[PDB]
Amino acid sequence: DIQLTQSPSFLSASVGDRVTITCRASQGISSYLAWYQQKPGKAPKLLIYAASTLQSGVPSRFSGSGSGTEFTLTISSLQPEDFATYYCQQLNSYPPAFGGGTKVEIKRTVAAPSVFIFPPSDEQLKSGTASVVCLLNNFYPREAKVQWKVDNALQSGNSQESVTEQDSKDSTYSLSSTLTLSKADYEKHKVYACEVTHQGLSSPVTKSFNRGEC
Amino acid sequence: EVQLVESGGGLIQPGGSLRLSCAASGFTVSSNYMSWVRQAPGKGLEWVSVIYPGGSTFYADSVKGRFTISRDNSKNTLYLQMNSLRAEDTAVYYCARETLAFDYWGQGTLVTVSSASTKGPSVFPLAPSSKSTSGGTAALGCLVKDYFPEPVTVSWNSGALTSGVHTFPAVLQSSGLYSLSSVVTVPSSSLGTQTYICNVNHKPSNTKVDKKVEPKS
Amino acid sequence: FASVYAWNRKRISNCVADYSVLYNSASFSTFKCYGVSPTKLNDLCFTNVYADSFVIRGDEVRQIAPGQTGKIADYNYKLPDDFTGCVIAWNSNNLDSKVGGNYNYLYRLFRKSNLKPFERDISTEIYQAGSTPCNGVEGFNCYFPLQSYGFQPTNGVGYQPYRVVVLSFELLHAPATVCGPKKSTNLVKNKCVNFNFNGLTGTGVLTESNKKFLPFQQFGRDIADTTDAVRDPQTLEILDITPCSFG
Ligand SMILES: *[C@@H]1O[C@H](CO)[C@@H](O)[C@H](O)[C@H]1NC(C)=O
Numbered sequence: 001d002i003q004l005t006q007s008p009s010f011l012s013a014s015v016g017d018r019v020t021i022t023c024r025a026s027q028g029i030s031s032y033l034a035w036y037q038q039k040p041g042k043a044p045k046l047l048i049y050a051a052s053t054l055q056s057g058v059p060s061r062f063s064g065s066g067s068g069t070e071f072t073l074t075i076s077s078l079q080p081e082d083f084a085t086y087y088c089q090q091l092n093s094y095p096p097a098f099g100g101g102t103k104v105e106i107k108r109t110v111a112a113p114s115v116f117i118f119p120p121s122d123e124q125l126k127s128g129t130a131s132v133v134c135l136l137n138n139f140y141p142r143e144a145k146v147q148w149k150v151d152n153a154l155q156s157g158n159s160q161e162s163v164t165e166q167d168s169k170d171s172t173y174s175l176s177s178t179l180t181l182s183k184a185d186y187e188k189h190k191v192y193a194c195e196v197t198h199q200g201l202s203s204p205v206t207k208s209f210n211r212g213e214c
Numbered sequence: 215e216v217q218l219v220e221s222g223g224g225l226i227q228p229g230g231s232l233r234l235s236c237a238a239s240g241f242t243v244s245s246n247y248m249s250w251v252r253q254a255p256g257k258g259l260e261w262v263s264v265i266y267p268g269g270s271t272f273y274a275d276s277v278k279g280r281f282t283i284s285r286d287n288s289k290n291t292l293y294l295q296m297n298s299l300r301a302e303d304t305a306v307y308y309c310a311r312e313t314l315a316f317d318y319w320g321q322g323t324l325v326t327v328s329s330a331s332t333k334g335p336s337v338f339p340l341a342p343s344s345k346s347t348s349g350g351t352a353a354l355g356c357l358v359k360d361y362f363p364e365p366v367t368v369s370w371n372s373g374a375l376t377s378g379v380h381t382f383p384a385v386l387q388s389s390g391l392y393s394l395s396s397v398v399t400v401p402s403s404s405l406g407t408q409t410y411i412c413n414v415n416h417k418p419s420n421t422k423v424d425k426k427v428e429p430k431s
Numbered sequence: 432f433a434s435v436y437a438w439n440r441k442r443i444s445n446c447v448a449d450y451s452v453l454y455n456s457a458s459f460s461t462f463k464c465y466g467v468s469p470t471k472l473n474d475l476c477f478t479n480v481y482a483d484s485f486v487i488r489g490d491e492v493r494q495i496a497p498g499q500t501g502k503i504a505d506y507n508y509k510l511p512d513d514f515t516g517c518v519i520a521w522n523s524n525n526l527d528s529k530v531g532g533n534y535n536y537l538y539r540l541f542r543k544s545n546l547k548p549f550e551r552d553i554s555t556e557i558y559q560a561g562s563t564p565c566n567g568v569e570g571f572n573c574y575f576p577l578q579s580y581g582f583q584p585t586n587g588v589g590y591q592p593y594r595v596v597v598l599s600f601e602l603l604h605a606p607a608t609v610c611g612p613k614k615s616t617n618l619v620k621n622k623c624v625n626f627n628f629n630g631l632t633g634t635g636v637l638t639e640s641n642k643k644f645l646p647f648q649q650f651g652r653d654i655a656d657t658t659d660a661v662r663d664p665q666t667l668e669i670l671d672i673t674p675c676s677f678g
Binding site: 043046050055095096101123135180208 | 383
Binding site: 241269 | 500501502505506541542543544545558559560561562563571572574578
């Protein structure tokens with residue numbers, strides 16, 4: 001029997017508020033564990049000691065609440081800069097069990113994207129392939145749609161997107177969609193268009209170019 | 215105070231091997247509980263091994279055997295000599311100084327794929343254009359594609375521009391190679407005016423190329 | 432009981448030890464014997480028995496054994512590699528664990544070097560980690576070396592307190608010492624019998640005597656040197672030994 005700790009993940013809030021995260025303990029543990037802050041693409045940093053005695057070098061926003069089981073952390077008066085996951089552990093015992101991690105989102109309001117379409121560089125068309133990039137800059141609701149169209153034909157299954165972590169300054173997202181074609185197939189059509197749908201747009205925005213027009 | 219740095223990650227196939235050196239930048243690795251923490255990408259953490267100030271091992275469950283930890287106090291180095299990697303550990307490795315809890319633990323990567331490409335970039339500049347221009351600002355960037363060895367970096371002007379510079383997560387194609395594109399916005403009055411050169415560095419290989427992005431012809 | 436980092440040490444001495452009341456008490460969760468299997472304890476004699484006592488977690492009872500490692504066996508209490516005694520352990524959740532946490536049971540978690548077997552260390556110096564002289568001051572590069580189990584009654588097993596007693600039989604080079612109790616039959620007066628009186632092995636009829644043995648003697652002998660009287664321990668009453676009936 002090992003302990004299996006659990007967490008109600010995927011939080012979403014606004015700044016200056018109260019939020020509270022609990023950590024189950026599916027066995028009788030005592031009162032010695034720890035919380036960590038894992039910013040994305042970085043190393044963890046422990047906040048709560050082996051109970052609630054918050055380790056030094058931290059602000060006054062965290063309040064670890066300890067018990068026999070069902071431990072619980074609480075953030076009051078949020079600040080835009082805590083974009084990361086929070087884990088549980090369990091000191092003392094050698095092989096320790098870790099949590100499941102809770103990402104926490106940060107609500108904003110309404111901010112449409114700047115859109116921009118980039119045709120393939122002349123160097124790449126030598127190589128024999130065409131990447132067509134479309135960029136969506138800064139934007140709260142990430143539930144954006146990127147529809148590629150080639151000569152007004154909606155393109156399915158030759159694109160890839162990725163999205164950035166919520167920005168620590170202005171709490172926005174940015175998205176890059178890449179359409180990949182062969183040189184041969186690229187040279188068979190004229191208008192390349194990228195149509196972005198988003199809540200901050202009253203009707204969708206299309207940025208487009210015409211292959212071969214300086 | 216203490217600024218643990220680690221080195222030794224790369225790429226290898228099963229039955230391979232690899233020594234990792236948790237270089238104790240900072241003091242007294244002779245008398246501290248040290249450990250290795252592992253996480254696969256998109257996953258939670260996992261614990262690997264631990265050394266006592268006095269010498270003991272206690273390896274983890276699945277990596278029981280086939281995996282060796284040691285220290286060197288006079289060099290202030292922790293040594294992790296592994297071998298016969300089931301390639302199922304392809305993970306991001308951390309070494310942390312357990313001080314009654316943990317904390318103080320650097321970072322370091324590894325991948326154990328059953329192949330090798332190790333090639334490097336295919337860089338193109340994505341020019342600033344009126345289709346990207348809107349009012350006061352316009353965006354330009356660099357597309358770095360088709361590389362296997364995951365850790366790759368693109369900076370703007372040798373690290374100068376930090377405003378608007380946003381590198382998007384790399385994408386894994388069906389071909390098996392990664393690709394990404396990093397873009398930055400800059401006032402539309404400044405399309406070609408100043409320097410905007412993306413510095414592409416591929417650390418598993420030794421690729422270093424600077425590409426200038428200029429408005430479309 | 433006593434802490435784990437300053438265990439106790441009682442030196443049991445000359446007496447009559449009955450390891451059966453221990454072995455069969457069924458109240459012990461762990462009764463391992465190493466030098467000697469348990470049932471043959473009440474049939475052997477040594478020079479000294481030592482008994483060490485302390486309190487640990489539930490799942491650290493597996494480090495009280497010859498040849499282990501871990502924070503307990505490394506530097507709290509180390510058993511030699513040719514141990515001879517037995518290790519006994521039983522759960523004590525209701526006595527030692529108290530609501531809010533019993534912070535009076537400490538253990539040592541940092542030491543320069545692992546203990547020699549049966550060595551003991553009650554010092555409380557700051558475990559200087561960083562090259563920087565600690566100067567007896569806490570902070571960075573210097574940890575206090577003792578931690579405390581915070582025992583609480585709602586802890587899963589393996590975190591509840593267990594009390595442990597380690598009996599170690601030793602045999603220096605003396606003349607004798609403690610041993611197990613001995614049996615005792617009855618006096619079949621008038622019946623050619625095969626007898627053993629604490630060493631005296633013989634055969635014959637046993638009969639009530641009327642000789643007055645000194646206040647320290649044991650048996651009696653006759654001219655031509657044959658045993659003809661003994662003294663019984665259980666009672667201490669002269670008894671004659673008449674040869675059997677042959678002819
Ligand atoms: C032996 O024990 C019995 C009681 O069982 C007692 O009556 C008797 O006096 C004792 N004799 C000696 C020598 O101890």
